């Protein structure tokens, strides 16, 4: 399937891509977006099964991305990643049906468990 | 449908019960429990479509109730309520499939939107 990683921080972004690319070992296509605007364009142009996005990104946050996705009912399973332990974000994330809220630094035990649950929810 | 309200404080428990009973108008069945053990017992002995539980309760939290419910073969749709804005509770709730996490003092608007969300999540899974 198609998994879309969104993070304005390139290190964290491309690192999770490599982590997911070797975890998938060719079975899943992993896509990368550097901001929310690009994410929405990939989300409109391609069918994304699992969306993994940061929350705090300039102008368009991950939650803003998810709000525009939830109104359309064909929508990816969403895993949020953030360094911020913010109840408000998590609260909105719940309301919008996010599967997991991973705290940075990313722990790939959690990353992989969440992405498999997201793959399953997509199916 | 059967909606189970769980809160260890009686005033809150009866308050949410009374409001939900008014909105139910007999269409839905409102029952209550005072703690997680009470909830677990009800949850094992009858179908509960919607679970509305406080988190901070003595010995067994609302999140602890949910850990037993996802084991059970069919799950209630779950609304969490709490007076405190706790990220750790919220993050666990997310991982546990919670539909909404409302802050006390509960707002009618938020409460009945979450309940209808739950009602349709349960009707979705029949
Ligand atoms: Mg960021
Ligand atoms: Mg309490």
Which residue reads 């059970």 in tokens?
Answer: B72
Q: How many domains does chain B have?
A: 1
Chain B contacts in chain A segment 81-120 (CB below 8 A): 85-88, 90-91, 93-95, 98-101, 103
- Using a CB-CB distance cutoff of 8 angstroms, which residues of chain A are in contact with residue B91? 85, 90, 101, 103
The answer on whether A41 is annotated among ligand-binding residues is no
User: Among candidates A75, A81, A80, which has minimal Cα distance to A44?
Assistant: A75
Chain centroid to CA A47: 14
Q: Give the residue numbers spanning the domain of A71.
A: 2-122
The Cα of A61 is separated from the nearest Cα of chain B by a number of Å equal to 18
Q: For residue B37, how many C-alpha atoms fall within 13 Å in the half-sphere facing its CB?
A: 2
Alpha-carbon gap, residue B100 to B117, rounded angstroms? 9
Which residue reads 């003595």 in tokens?
Answer: B58
Q: How far apart are the CA of A82 and the centre of ligand 1, in A? A: 7
Is the Cβ–Cβ distance between A11 and A19 less than 8 Å? Answer: no
Longest C-alpha distance within chain B, in Å?
Answer: 36
Go through chain B and list every residue after which a break occurs, taking a C to next N gap over 2.5 angstroms, comma-separated. none
Chain centroid to CA B19: 14
| Token pair belonging to B117 | 């969300």
Is the Cβ–Cβ distance between B43 and B4 less than 8 Å? Answer: yes
Domain containing B12 — which CATH number?
Answer: 3.40.50.2300
DSSP string over A7-18: -S-HHHHHHHHH
Cα→Cα distances A30→A11, B57, B85, Å: 16, 42, 34
The answer on whether B11 is annotated among ligand-binding residues is no
H or E element that contains A54: strand A50-54
Task: Indicate the SS3 state at residue A94.
Answer: helix
Phi then psi for residue B66, to 5 deg, are: -65, -35
Query: Closest ligand to A6 CA?
Result: 1
The answer on whether A64 is annotated among ligand-binding residues is no
Q: What is the resolution of this structure in A?
A: 2.3
CB contact under 8 A, B94 and A90: yes
Structure determined by: X-ray
Alpha-carbon gap, residue A50 to A117, rounded angstroms? 10
Is the Cβ–Cβ distance between B79 and B102 less than 8 Å? Answer: yes
Alpha helices in A1-123 (DSSP H): 10-24, 36-45, 62-71, 87-95, 108-122
- Using a CB-CB distance cutoff of 8 angstroms, which residues of chain B are in contact with residue A85? 87-88, 91
Q: How far apart are the CA of B36 and the centre of ligand 2, in A? A: 11
Strand order in the sheet with A77-82: A29-33, A2-6, A50-54, A77-82, A100-103
């Amino acid at each position: 399937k198609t998994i879309l990683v969104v993070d304005d921080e390139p290190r964290a972004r491309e690192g999770m891509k490599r982590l997911l690319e070797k975890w998938a070992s060719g079975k899943h296509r992993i896509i990368t977006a550097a901001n929310g605007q690009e994410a929405l364009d990939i989300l409109r142009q391609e069918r994304v099964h699992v969306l993994l996005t940061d929350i705090r990104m300039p102008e368009i946050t991950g939650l803003d991305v998810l709000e525009e996705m939830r109104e359309k009912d064909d929508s990816p399973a969403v895993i949020l990643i953030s360094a911020y332990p913010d109840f408000d974000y998590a609260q909105k994330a719940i309301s919008l049906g996010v599967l997991n809220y991973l705290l940075k630094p990313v722990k790939k035990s959690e990353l992989f468990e969440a992405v498999e649950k997201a793959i399953h929810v997509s199916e």
